[PDB]
Amino acid sequence: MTNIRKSHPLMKIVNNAFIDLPAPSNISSWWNFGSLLGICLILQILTGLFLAMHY
Amino acid sequence: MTNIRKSHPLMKIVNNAFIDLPAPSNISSWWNFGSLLGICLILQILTGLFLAMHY
Amino acid sequence: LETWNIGVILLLTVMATAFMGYVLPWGQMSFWGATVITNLLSAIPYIGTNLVEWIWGGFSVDKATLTRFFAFHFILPFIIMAIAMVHLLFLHETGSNNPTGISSDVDKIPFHPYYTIKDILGALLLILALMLLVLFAPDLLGDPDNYTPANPLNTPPHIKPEWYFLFAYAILRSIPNKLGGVLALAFSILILALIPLLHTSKQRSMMFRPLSQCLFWALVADLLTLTWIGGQPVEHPYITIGQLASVLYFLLILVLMPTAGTIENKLLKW
Amino acid sequence: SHTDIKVPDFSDYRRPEVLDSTKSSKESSEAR
Amino acid sequence: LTRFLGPRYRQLARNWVPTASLWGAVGAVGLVWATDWRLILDW
Amino acid sequence: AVSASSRWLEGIRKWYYNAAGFNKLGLMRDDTIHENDDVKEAIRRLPENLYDDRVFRIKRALDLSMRQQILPKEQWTKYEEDKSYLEPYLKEVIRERKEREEWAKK
Amino acid sequence: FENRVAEKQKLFQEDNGLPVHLKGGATDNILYRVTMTLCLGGTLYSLYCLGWASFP
Amino acid sequence: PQDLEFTRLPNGLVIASLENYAPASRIGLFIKAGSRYENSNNLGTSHLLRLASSLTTKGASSFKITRGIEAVGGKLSVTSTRENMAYTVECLRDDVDILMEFLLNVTTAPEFRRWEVAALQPQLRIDKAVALQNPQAHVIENLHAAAYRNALANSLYCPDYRIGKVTPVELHDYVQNHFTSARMALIGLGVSHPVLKQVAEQFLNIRGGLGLSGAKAKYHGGEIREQNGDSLVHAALVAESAAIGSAEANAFSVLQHVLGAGPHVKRGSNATSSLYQAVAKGVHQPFDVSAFNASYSDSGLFGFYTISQAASAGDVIKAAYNQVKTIAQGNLSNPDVQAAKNKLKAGYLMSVESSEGFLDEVGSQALAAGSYTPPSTVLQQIDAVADADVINAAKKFVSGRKSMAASGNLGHTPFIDEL
Amino acid sequence: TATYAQALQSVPETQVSQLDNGLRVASEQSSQPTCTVGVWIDAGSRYESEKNNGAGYFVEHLAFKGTKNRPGNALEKEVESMGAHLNAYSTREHTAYYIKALSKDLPKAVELLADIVQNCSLEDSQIEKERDVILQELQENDTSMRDVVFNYLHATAFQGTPLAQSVEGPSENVRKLSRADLTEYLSRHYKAPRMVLAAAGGLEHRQLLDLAQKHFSGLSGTYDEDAVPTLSPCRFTGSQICHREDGLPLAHVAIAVEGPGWAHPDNVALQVANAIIGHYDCTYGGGAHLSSPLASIAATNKLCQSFQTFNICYADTGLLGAHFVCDHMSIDDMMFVLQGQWMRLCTSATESEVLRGKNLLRNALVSHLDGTTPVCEDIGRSLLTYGRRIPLAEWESRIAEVDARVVREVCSKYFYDQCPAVAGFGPIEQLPDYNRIRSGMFWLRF
Amino acid sequence: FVLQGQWMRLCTSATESEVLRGKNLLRNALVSHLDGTTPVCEDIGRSLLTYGRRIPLAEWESRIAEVDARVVREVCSKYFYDQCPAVAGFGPIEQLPDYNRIRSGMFWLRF
Amino acid sequence: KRSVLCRESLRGQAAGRPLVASVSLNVPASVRY
Numbered sequence A, B: 001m002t003n004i005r006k007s008h009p010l011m012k013i014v015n016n017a018f019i020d021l022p023a024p025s026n027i028s029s030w031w032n033f034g035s036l037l038g039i040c041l042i043l044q045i046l047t048g049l050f051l052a053m054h055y
Numbered sequence C: 001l002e003t004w005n006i007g008v009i010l011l012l013t014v015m016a017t018a019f020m021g022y023v024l025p026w027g028q029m030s031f032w033g034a035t036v037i038t039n040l041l042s043a044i045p046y047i048g049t050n051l052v053e054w055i056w057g058g059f060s061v062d063k064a065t066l067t068r069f070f071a072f073h074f075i076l077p078f079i080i081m082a083i084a085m086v087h088l089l090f091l092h093e094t095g096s097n098n099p100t101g102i103s104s105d106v107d108k109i110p111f112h113p114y115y116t117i118k119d120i121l122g123a124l125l126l127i128l129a130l131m132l133l134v135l136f137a138p139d140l141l142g143d144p145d146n147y148t149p150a151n152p153l154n155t156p157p158h159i160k161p162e163w164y165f166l167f168a169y170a171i172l173r174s175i176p177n178k179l180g181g182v183l184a185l186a187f188s189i190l191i192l193a194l195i196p197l198l199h200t201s202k203q204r205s206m207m208f209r210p211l212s213q214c215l216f217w218a219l220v221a222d223l224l225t226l227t228w229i230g231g232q233p234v235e236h237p238y239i240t241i242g243q244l245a246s247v248l249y250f251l252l253i254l255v256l257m258p259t260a261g262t263i264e265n266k267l268l269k270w
Numbered sequence D: 001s002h003t004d005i006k007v008p009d010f011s012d013y014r015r016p017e018v019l020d021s022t023k024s025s026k027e028s029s030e031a032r
Numbered sequence E: 001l002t003r004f005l006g007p008r009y010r011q012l013a014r015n016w017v018p019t020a021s022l023w024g025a026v027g028a029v030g031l032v033w034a035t036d037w038r039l040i041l042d043w
Numbered sequence F: 001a002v003s004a005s006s007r008w009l010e011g012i013r014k015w016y017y018n019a020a021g022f023n024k025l026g027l028m029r030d031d032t033i034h035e036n037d038d039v040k041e042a043i044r045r046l047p048e049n050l051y052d053d054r055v056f057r058i059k060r061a062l063d064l065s066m067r068q069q070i071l072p073k074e075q076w077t078k079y080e081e082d083k084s085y086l087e088p089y090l091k092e093v094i095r096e097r098k099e100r101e102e103w104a105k106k
Numbered sequence G: 001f002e003n004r005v006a007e008k009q010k011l012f013q014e015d016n017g018l019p020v021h022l023k024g025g026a027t028d029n030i031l032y033r034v035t036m037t038l039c040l041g042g043t044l045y046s047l048y049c050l051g052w053a054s055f056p
Numbered sequence H: 001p002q003d004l005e006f007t008r009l010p011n012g013l014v015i016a017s018l019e020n021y022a023p024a025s026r027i028g029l030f031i032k033a034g035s036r037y038e039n040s041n042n043l044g045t046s047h048l049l050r051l052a053s054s055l056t057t058k059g060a061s062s063f064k065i066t067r068g069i070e071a072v073g074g075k076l077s078v079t080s081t082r083e084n085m086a087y088t089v090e091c092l093r094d095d096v097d098i099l100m101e102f103l104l105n106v107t108t109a110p111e112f113r114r115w116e117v118a119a120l121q122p123q124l125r126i127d128k129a130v131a132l133q134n135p136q137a138h139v140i141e142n143l144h145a146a147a148y149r150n151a152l153a154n155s156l157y158c159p160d161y162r163i164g165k166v167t168p169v170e171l172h173d174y175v176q177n178h179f180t181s182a183r184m185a186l187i188g189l190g191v192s193h194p195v196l197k198q199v200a201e202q203f204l205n206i207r208g209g210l211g212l213s214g215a216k217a218k219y220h221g222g223e224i225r226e227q228n229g230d231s232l233v234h235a236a237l238v239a240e241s242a243a244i245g246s247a248e249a250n251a252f253s254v255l256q257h258v259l260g261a262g263p264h265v266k267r268g269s270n271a272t273s274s275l276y277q278a279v280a281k282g283v284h285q286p287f288d289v290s291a292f293n294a295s296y297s298d299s300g301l302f303g304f305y306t307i308s309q310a311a312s313a314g315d316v317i318k319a320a321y322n323q324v325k326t327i328a329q330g331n332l333s334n335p336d337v338q339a340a341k342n343k344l345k346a347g348y349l350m351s352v353e354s355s356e357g358f359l360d361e362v363g364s365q366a367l368a369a370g371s372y373t374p375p376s377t378v379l380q381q382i383d384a385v386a387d388a389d390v391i392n393a394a395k396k397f398v399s400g401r402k403s404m405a406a407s408g409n410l411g412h413t414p415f416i417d418e419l
Numbered sequence I: 001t002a003t004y005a006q007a008l009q010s011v012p013e014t015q016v017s018q019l020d021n022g023l024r025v026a027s028e029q030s031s032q033p034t035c036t037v038g039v040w041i042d043a044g045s046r047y048e049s050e051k052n053n054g055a056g057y058f059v060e061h062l063a064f065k066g067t068k069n070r071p072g073n074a075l076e077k078e079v080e081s082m083g084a085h086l087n088a089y090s091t092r093e094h095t096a097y098y099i100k101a102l103s104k105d106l107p108k109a110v111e112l113l114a115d116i117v118q119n120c121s122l123e124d125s126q127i128e129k130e131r132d133v134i135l136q137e138l139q140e141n142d143t144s145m146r147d148v149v150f151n152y153l154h155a156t157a158f159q160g161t162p163l164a165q166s167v168e169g170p171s172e173n174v175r176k177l178s179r180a181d182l183t184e185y186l187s188r189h190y191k192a193p194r195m196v197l198a199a200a201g202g203l204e205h206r207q208l209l210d211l212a213q214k215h216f217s218g219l220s221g222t223y224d225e226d227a228v229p230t231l232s233p234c235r236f237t238g239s240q241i242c243h244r245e246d247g248l249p250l251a252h253v254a255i256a257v258e259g260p261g262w263a264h265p266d267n268v269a270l271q272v273a274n275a276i277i278g279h280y281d282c283t284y285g286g287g288a289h290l291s292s293p294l295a296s297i298a299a300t301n302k303l304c305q306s307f308q309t310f311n312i313c314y315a316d317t318g319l320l321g322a323h324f325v326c327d328h329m330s331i332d333d334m335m336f337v338l339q340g341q342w343m344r345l346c347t348s349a350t351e352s353e354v355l356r357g358k359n360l361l362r363n364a365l366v367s368h369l370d371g372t373t374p375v376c377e378d379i380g381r382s383l384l385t386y387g388r389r390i391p392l393a394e395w396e397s398r399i400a401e402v403d404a405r406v407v408r409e410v411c412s413k414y415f416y417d418q419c420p421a422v423a424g425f426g427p428i429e430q431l432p433d434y435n436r437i438r439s440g441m442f443w444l445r446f
Numbered sequence J: 001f002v003l004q005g006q007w008m009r010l011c012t013s014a015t016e017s018e019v020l021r022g023k024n025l026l027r028n029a030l031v032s033h034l035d036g037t038t039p040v041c042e043d044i045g046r047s048l049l050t051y052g053r054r055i056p057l058a059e060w061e062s063r064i065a066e067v068d069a070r071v072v073r074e075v076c077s078k079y080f081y082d083q084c085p086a087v088a089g090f091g092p093i094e095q096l097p098d099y100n101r102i103r104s105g106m107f108w109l110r111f
Numbered sequence K: 001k002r003s004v005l006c007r008e009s010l011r012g013q014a015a016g017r018p019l020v021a022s023v024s025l026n027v028p029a030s031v032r033y
């Protein structure tokens, strides 16, 4: 490969678990809670750090 | 492979960057600062968390 | 299994987090809730007592404890993120199961094309709920109305954990004995890691097994029932109910489901 | 090649127990 | 569970106890320094 | 001594399958099993016909799941047609491994 | 039921130079050591109690 | 103490036995399937069959089979010949029974499972690769396919193109047609014949005539040449030998030895070997030459084998020929035939001085003849060869359709018209 | 009917006998056609000094090319025309020449052999003709990784000792080697008692003893002094020799822990141990189902091409280990399984497992003895090795005392906490660091 | 990735050099085909139902000549940019890009 | 591969009953004459 951004950096390859990964077709709405799970972890954190900026 | 603890867990394989990895032979004492650098981060961290337990 | 065991750790780590953060604001509910939970650790016979006193940094919950929670609340979430990623790592080695319960390798899709929009959409609804709550009914879901600065002699006779921890408080109540209640409280949550071993059917998918779909739902509704007890006076009516709900929960998880599994397998002739 | 190659004298490098040329290291080796 | 149990396995268990037995002793020693029992100190 | 009870069970079994998603889906009961190490080996043991079949079935099935669409009433898996085609293969794989344990044990 | 005394007869008649109380495997051995340990310890404990009770 | 004891049954399977003194007993069922029993469509099947001995069968799972023999320290060896297929089975006196029941499953109850046979497949390549490391094997193989047309021209190793294509009904068919009663011969080196028979009778009664593979023989002169990059070159020059267990044959064997150069001395050079002397004189310093002699049921192959370097190939090759022409011109003195003879005789005896050797010798005889010829008798036959006889045979190589196979840099390797 | 044990006791006993000079006579009778008479001299490579390091091995090329009685090709012609084969093998401890031959051929057999040992017509021409050959053999032995590596092992586990030298010897000692030097060599070491005249098959001991004629007896003090130099201990050294050649397609690794002399109760129990690990090749028919883990793993995971455990037995020294050939990328995994098998063995052996190996042993040790040649070499070598006993029926007994605890305790002497002898002929790029192989011999984890 | 990549580059980043080389290639392709009797006959026959009754042979060079790197860039972006692909495979197509991936390959945000 | 340079290699095939006999076994494996 040449200038395939993704696998060029080794780091950026590690991020291709989001984009290129095999994901089953059929899949209830239930699985979105994984992702949202992370969403919440990131929101609490940003929020926490600002509150702990005045607590 | 069977029962090769290291590669069994995928997680444990990731840790064989410490044990099996190719390391140059010749190698000044200077290199020991990388590792030491990380000991310092861990030290600071445990200390910090105990200080910030009573600050 | 390996992914399940991380999950479990995840779950419990957040659980700690939530317990200490709620105490940071140091209000009547928080103050007491910490005492009664922490003290519930003094059930252990030999150590307990000494150990509750170390955790608190003294004999009560004064400044010493209050700054500890601030520090651990702060540092848990960072540690937890590492865990999450570790969790993700393991899961990436076998991909996502489905409603049918069968491998999909014969049907696989681009995560980017499809699942990035799904996830963004998911967000959109998630945020919706978070702002709907936060903007229209800020306090609604935050049962506790105790915006009262904590006075160590004062007590809301109705002391209870939040909705996430409501189930835990209820579990402790059904057992007369202190220690029996702490064990059973831990087992509530800690019973998760058993379920792998309990699995009895040949279909990892409950989707094709009615009977577990019925007892799965019931557990969920038993779980709702337990959450209710949590905000209940600890009196006869609620006691007797909780006690049968706490047996139902462990039956559903320990004994009913596993049998149902077998049955279904035998009706399919499997 | 392989036949020609032979070990460098390890007497200076080698331990006192194994230093001797004509005697056993088994009854001297364990202590080291 | 059932698969693990075996007639053949016993030598390993016996061997494990010593290593396990040796390991068990270390914890008592390790715990004791932290525990600081007056009785332990007296010992 | 099972004549009436088992007879009810036989009737019950059809209901159980009907109750079960696989019959409704149209996919075979054997195909539904939790893909573990034994199933896996059985799977591998399948003939081209049997085995390619299980791939289309699951393809058609995960397609439906993705679209939340059920198959037409006319095209559904009928309980009376329980191809337990994995069963044969799956049994042995287990059989072999149970033995392995016996030989290993003694 | 079973009837496999024939297997055990063979197992116990096997000329492995082992004493009957060990001729049967690894468990025999752990049982032995457990028993022996409890007895000796107990005996030690008892001597301690007597030394202790000897005094006013 | 007790000598062997053959017994042909109604099925036509032979069985022998020798309760020996020593601790180790070895059974070995020799079935009459060689490589020669496959067609264009069936080539490579014995090979795979040979490698698939430890697969699940009707009464014993691949795991039990292997772990079982290990349990007791037993060995299970299958010997495959262009004509025959010996299925050997060694173990301790006490354990024959556990072992025998293994040999019987492997051979009468194979269950080639699509999945199991499939994982083997790749083994064929690995096996072919390791035996094709000795020039001798690819040349010696090339020889047989050049010299024959149809049956014995089939090689022992599976053809590269066939490997993964070996199907389970193929294996099943081959066993069924060839692994039968009429083609079998049990052989024990430390078992009771009385008890052997019983077992034989209980487990070896299956029907199957010969040639459902396409039996028949035929010789066709031809040359197979394989160019390489290797300094050294090997080539074989061979004419229709006499057939198996016949006088002509036997004569060949004796002749073989008059030229035959299989060193009897470490680091030692032959004084006796004519080929070597003659070759040597006209040849360079480093060179290797040996006489070749093959004998099968319906045909043979006699001639020599050479190992020369690039430029010396011809010189050696002709040299060797010329010398064997000498014997065919008549030039051969009595003193050398008797030496030969004694050489042969000594060899055959040492051949059978071991259990493994004896067991092979015996089974071998049971598939050819139908009984065991004792050594002595054997010895007599070889002696009957006339000094002339030898010459006469030799006359036949020089005046018999040529067929050669070589490998390496072939700038200097004579063709058919070259010699 | 007849049962293993029985057979065992019924086996023809070996008769050991002595001439006046110490010529040892042994023989096992069967009244069979072919016979393999042999003279098993025990002056090997380990007696050689740095110069004559390849002495003995040189004599072996001359052994069969003339006697003052039987000049140029008179030996071969004689053997040949009989149909007898003549072989010469040389070890680091044992030189031996034997003949395979019709039983009626003893007469001229035993004469020949005897002749060979004593009179060897060796002219300058034959010396300069052999040199060239030797130098060419050497070159060819460098073409064999397995031979290159096993030499290395010895050199590094024997660093600083006479025993660590190649039997082939030093390149240039072949060039240099004085013609006078082969004499002193022979003269000093071929003097029996060293020697044994053994044989098996259809002969009568009586005649072998009567038939044998001693050309000369080495009463010599030098003969004793020459022996005297021999038998000294050779210092044990755990070092590695790593000769990396990425040019080569595979990798050969020979890993060893020093062991017992020829005679020792621990020395049969070891064997039973290696029975368990076993030996394995690309072409084993059992592969994945084979009962020895290294084999199964190997078979299963395409871990290695071929692997064998060995027990090299010398009077004062012993090389113990296995040897595996494996792709460049699998050197470490096979190291891991192997060493792993060792440790598991000295801490967790189970009676089942040791009982299977046991029985393997018996077979290996009975089946070897099939044939005349075999028996003869056991009888000859057995006498300089283990002295004048023939432990054949004892074996089963000794092998019988084997217990899972016996096997465990004996294995732990030699492998556990001991320092390895490792050599490889790379692709050794992935070969474990000496300290890693070291810590492999004790159990914290892995 | 490489191919689609090439497309994109083409309609945004064509350089006169590059176009001029392809230009010339075309000429040759178009001249050398016409070597031989069969070839000329087909061009003449097919040309008539295709392009009608013209034989644009000498024109070509002219037309080909009007080629510019801007011409080639604007002409390519009508047909490949933002346009929806027609993709078929005959697997192992297990790794073949998801329709939406292929699609997004016809426009340039990154990659 | 083993170098075949000198007078040592004579290999040529010809036995009594067996000729070119190939044997495959789990314990062992080979090619004779």
Ligand code: HEM
Pocket (backbone or CB within 6 Å): A041, A044, A045, A047, A048, A049, A050, A051, A052, A055, C014, C017, C018, C021, C022, C023, C024, C025, C073, C074, C077
């Ligand atoms: C999911 C992990 C976390 C959860 C479950 C959580 C939950 C909570 C809860 C329930 C409260 C009580 C608020 C109230 O009712 O007044 C709280 C307070 C607080 N948390 Fe968090 N929190 C988390 C992470 C964090 C982080 C990462 C930080 C700092 C970076 C943080 C900083 C604070 C501060 C300073 C307060 C005190 C003031 C207040 O009451 O808002 N928290 N947290």
Ligand code: HEM
Pocket (backbone or CB within 6 Å): A030, A031, A032, A033, A034, A035, A036, A037, A038, A041, C003, C004, C005, C006, C007, C008, C009, C010, C011, C012, C014, C080, C084, C087, C091, C095, C096, C097, C098, C192
């Ligand atoms: C910090 C809290 C957590 C986060 C952010 C998180 C996140 C995720 C995400 C984003 C996924 C993929 C989508 C899905 O299947 O829903 C996932 C899957 C999974 N999680 Fe979690 N998780 C958390 C807690 C847990 C807990 C407590 C456990 C179990 C003890 C767990 C076990 C699993 C398992 C088994 C899967 C894979 C299921 C499958 O698709 O077959 N998770 N997690």
